[PDB]
Amino acid sequence: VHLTPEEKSAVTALWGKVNVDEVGGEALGRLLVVYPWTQRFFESFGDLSTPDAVMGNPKVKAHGKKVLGAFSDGLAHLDNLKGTFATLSELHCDKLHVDPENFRLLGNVLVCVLAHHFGKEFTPPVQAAYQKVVAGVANALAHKYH
Amino acid sequence: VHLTPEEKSAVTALWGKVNVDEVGGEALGRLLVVYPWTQRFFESFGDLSTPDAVMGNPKVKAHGKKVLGAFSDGLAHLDNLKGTFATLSELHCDKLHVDPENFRLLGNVLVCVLAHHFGKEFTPPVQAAYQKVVAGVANALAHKYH
Amino acid sequence: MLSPADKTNVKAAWGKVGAHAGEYGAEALERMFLSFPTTKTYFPHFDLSHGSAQVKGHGKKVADALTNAVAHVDDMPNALSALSDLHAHKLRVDPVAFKLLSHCLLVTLAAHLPAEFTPAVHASLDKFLASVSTVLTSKYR
Amino acid sequence: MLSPADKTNVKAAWGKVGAHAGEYGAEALERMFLSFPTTKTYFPHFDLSHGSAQVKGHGKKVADALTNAVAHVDDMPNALSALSDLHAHKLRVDPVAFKLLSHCLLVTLAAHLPAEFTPAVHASLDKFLASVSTVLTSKYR
Numbered sequence: 129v130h131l132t133p134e135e136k137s138a139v140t141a142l143w144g145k146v147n148v149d150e151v152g153g154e155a156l157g158r159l160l161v162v163y164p165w166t167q168r169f170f171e172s173f174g175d176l177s178t179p180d181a182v183m184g185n186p187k188v189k190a191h192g193k194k195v196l197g198a199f200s201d202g203l204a205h206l207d208n209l210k211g212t213f214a215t216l217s218e219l220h221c222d223k224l225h226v227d228p229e230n231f232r233l234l235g236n237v238l239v240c241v242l243a244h245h246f247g248k249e250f251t252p253p254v255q256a257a258y259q260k261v262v263a264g265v266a267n268a269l270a271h272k273y274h
Numbered sequence: 275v276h277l278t279p280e281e282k283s284a285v286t287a288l289w290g291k292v293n294v295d296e297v298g299g300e301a302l303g304r305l306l307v308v309y310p311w312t313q314r315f316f317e318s319f320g321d322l323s324t325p326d327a328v329m330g331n332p333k334v335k336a337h338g339k340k341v342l343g344a345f346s347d348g349l350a351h352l353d354n355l356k357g358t359f360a361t362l363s364e365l366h367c368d369k370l371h372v373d374p375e376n377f378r379l380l381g382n383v384l385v386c387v388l389a390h391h392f393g394k395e396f397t398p399p400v401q402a403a404y405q406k407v408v409a410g411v412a413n414a415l416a417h418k419y420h
Numbered sequence: 421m422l423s424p425a426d427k428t429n430v431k432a433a434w435g436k437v438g439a440h441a442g443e444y445g446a447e448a449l450e451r452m453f454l455s456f457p458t459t460k461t462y463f464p465h466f467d468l469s470h471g472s473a474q475v476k477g478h479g480k481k482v483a484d485a486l487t488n489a490v491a492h493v494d495d496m497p498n499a500l501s502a503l504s505d506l507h508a509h510k511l512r513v514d515p516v517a518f519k520l521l522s523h524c525l526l527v528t529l530a531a532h533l534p535a536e537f538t539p540a541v542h543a544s545l546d547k548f549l550a551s552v553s554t555v556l557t558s559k560y561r
Numbered sequence: 562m563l564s565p566a567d568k569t570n571v572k573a574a575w576g577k578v579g580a581h582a583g584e585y586g587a588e589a590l591e592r593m594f595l596s597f598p599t600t601k602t603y604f605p606h607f608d609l610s611h612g613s614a615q616v617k618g619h620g621k622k623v624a625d626a627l628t629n630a631v632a633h634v635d636d637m638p639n640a641l642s643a644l645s646d647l648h649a650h651k652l653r654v655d656p657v658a659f660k661l662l663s664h665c666l667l668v669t670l671a672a673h674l675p676a677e678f679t680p681a682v683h684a685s686l687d688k689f690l691a692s693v694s695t696v697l698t699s700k701y702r
């Protein structure tokens with residue numbers, strides 16, 4: 129999306145240091161604990177009664193990796209989030225019945241997790257470039273809903 | 275604004291029956307009464323303590339006609355809302371300091387007002403087309419914010 | 421927080437709906453589904469075509485609950501407790517969706533009450549629907 | 562509503578905030594202004610550049626009202642009555658903007674309190690900021 133070059137490169141460089149497995153595991157898990165109603169799509173993951181259980185759930189952890197995996201491949205197509213995520217958008221609407229407001233919740237969780245992990249390095253200007261990316265990603269994922 | 279030509283004709287057709295001066299005053303008045311925090315922008319308009327004070331206020335009425343006259347002109351340019359509203363966008367941001375969430379609140383109130391005026395004529399699909407229009411107009415008015 | 425005046429305006433407006441509640445509930449639902457298609461993700465098991473019977477049936481159920489809240493406007497958290505458990509623990513609808521339905525019920529009411537949908541009343545009904553939404557969402561976490 | 566676990570979680574995290582509260586308040590504002598530029602519409606009278614004194618000063622005021630809320634966590638409406646009056650009748654800030662500041666505060670805490678910002682504490686802080694926000698918008702209409 130409307131991303132400044134100095135912005136574009138702030139994102140990219142930061143992402144190069146991200147452990148996608150850990151981070152995805154943590155974003156998704158935080159999502160299920162901070163906003164419990166999102167657990168409605170995960171009944172078959174198992175016990176999700178307590179934060180600990182949610183955070184130790186291998187299917188959560190594994191699903192977290194998949195999601196962020198797909199997100200990660202997206203930061204390489206910033207000039208075209210819509211095309212990259214179109215099939216995903218359809219599947220989310222037509223097979224999975226996921227309200228896109230959930231994509232926004234995850235993005236905000238994602239931004240808290242990046243801050244948790246990188247501390248001082250996650251500066252306000254670096255946070256701004258990520259907020260653009262995350263909203264851009266959410267909007268791409270909601271694009272094919274009818 | 276992605277609008278179907280059947281949507282576009284539904285919208286333009288209804289709009290042809292609108293008395294903009296009156297609907298404009300009603301929409302603005304109801305905005306100020308239903309969402310009283312929005313009065314913050316209108317201290318110079320005098321008395322706004324009761325609904326009749328607001329609805330009959332000659333300044334609210336004049337200002338309403340002016341808002342809607344400009345919304346109208348925008349309905350003749352659905353393919354270039356951004357362009358049409360560029361200067362007004364700048365003006366609302368740098369001189370008036372109006373938070374864009376106000377354009378969306380006003381949008382929703384306009385839709386109930388049209389609903390009030392046209393009754394059954396305001397069909398579910400006709401409403402759906404107006405919802406896209408007010409959203410697009412609100413995004414065009416926010417687009418030069420920085 | 422509803423005021424005496426709000427409570428009066430709401431009872432007066434809902435009194436006029438009367439035995440129209442269900443009808444207007446279905447209509448509200450149909451407006452929402454067309455205006456805000458993402459809300460369809462909550463009823464994947466329904467048939468959402470115009471005049472659909474599951475939509476009518478659900479519309480009546482929604483309108484009955486609103487009718488009950490009006491009948492119990494000074495005790496809404498308790499009158500709506502069961503419904504509130506259901507939404508928080510089973511249906512888990514995202515909170516923003518309540519705002520969408522609320523707008524649509526308001527549109528539906530406006531289209532049917534040309535005489536009673538005054539600014540004062542519109543205001544009161546908007547606060548009323550936000551209080552109902554707050555109650556139904558109060559046990560989410 | 563905040564549970565006992567929540568109050569405790571909140572008091573503990575804000576416990577380690579200690580004397581950086583003012584610095585974190587300021588940081589959160591700066592984060593909000595940059596990420597959500599529309600929020601600048603509420604501070605046309607301020608110099609909003611990096612490290613300006615109006616932001617700092619303001620940051621300390623906000624942080625201090627949060628200190629006061631946590632300490633009166635059992636009695637917020639009363640503890641924040643005056644601030645509630647102030648926002649509803651004078652500042653008249655749009656309710657949606659409270660969500661933005663809250664998110665920026667949360668990011669600010671996650672950035673400065675790594676060991677403390679566990680998934681449970683994150684949940685509680687979010688509920689708390691929401692409760693505060695509700696209280697600050699409870700008299701709007």
Ligand code: HEM
Nearest residue numbers: 166169170194195196198199216224226230231234265269
């Ligand atoms: C950052 C935005 C997101 C991205 C990029 C993403 C990506 C993906 C991908 C790649 C899959 C695998 C589909 C396949 O089998 O090929 C998937 C599945 C799924 N996603 Fe998303 N996802 C996102 C957010 C969400 C969130 C917010 C929710 C709900 C809380 C959600 C719910 C699901 C569900 C329920 C599945 C199917 C899981 C299963 O097979 O059991 N997703 N997602």
Ligand code: HEM
Nearest residue numbers: 312315316340341342344345362370372376377380411415
């Ligand atoms: C459809 C959305 C809107 C449109 C098309 C619109 C259009 C206009 C126009 C044409 C003007 C006159 C410009 C000038 O004086 O040079 C104006 C001024 C103004 N607008 Fe907007 N307006 C919109 C919404 C709003 C709303 C929602 C608010 C606040 C709730 C607002 C606040 C103002 C204020 C305070 C003025 C200046 C009043 C004065 O002259 O003292 N506007 N707008």
Ligand code: HEM
Nearest residue numbers: 459462463481482485486503511513517518521552553556
């Ligand atoms: C004005 C606010 C609302 C009220 C008063 C309300 C009331 C009700 C009632 C009475 C039921 C029936 C439960 C039973 O079987 O006894 C129900 C179920 C349901 N509601 Fe809510 N509702 C509201 C808003 C929402 C909205 C916003 C959503 C999502 C957009 C929603 C989604 C659902 C779903 C999916 C069911 C189950 C449908 C079925 O499978 O039969 N409701 N609601």
Ligand code: HEM
Nearest residue numbers: 600603604622623626627644652654658659662693694697
């Ligand atoms: C976490 C919720 C918030 C709390 C606790 C809070 C607290 C405060 C406090 C303590 C003051 C100072 C009052 C005084 O000087 O006596 C204040 C003023 C103010 N706040 Fe709120 N605030 C919150 C959110 C917001 C929101 C989100 C905004 C707008 C985006 C906002 C805009 C303002 C403005 C413009 C002032 C006046 C500043 C000045 O003119 O010096 N506040 N707030």
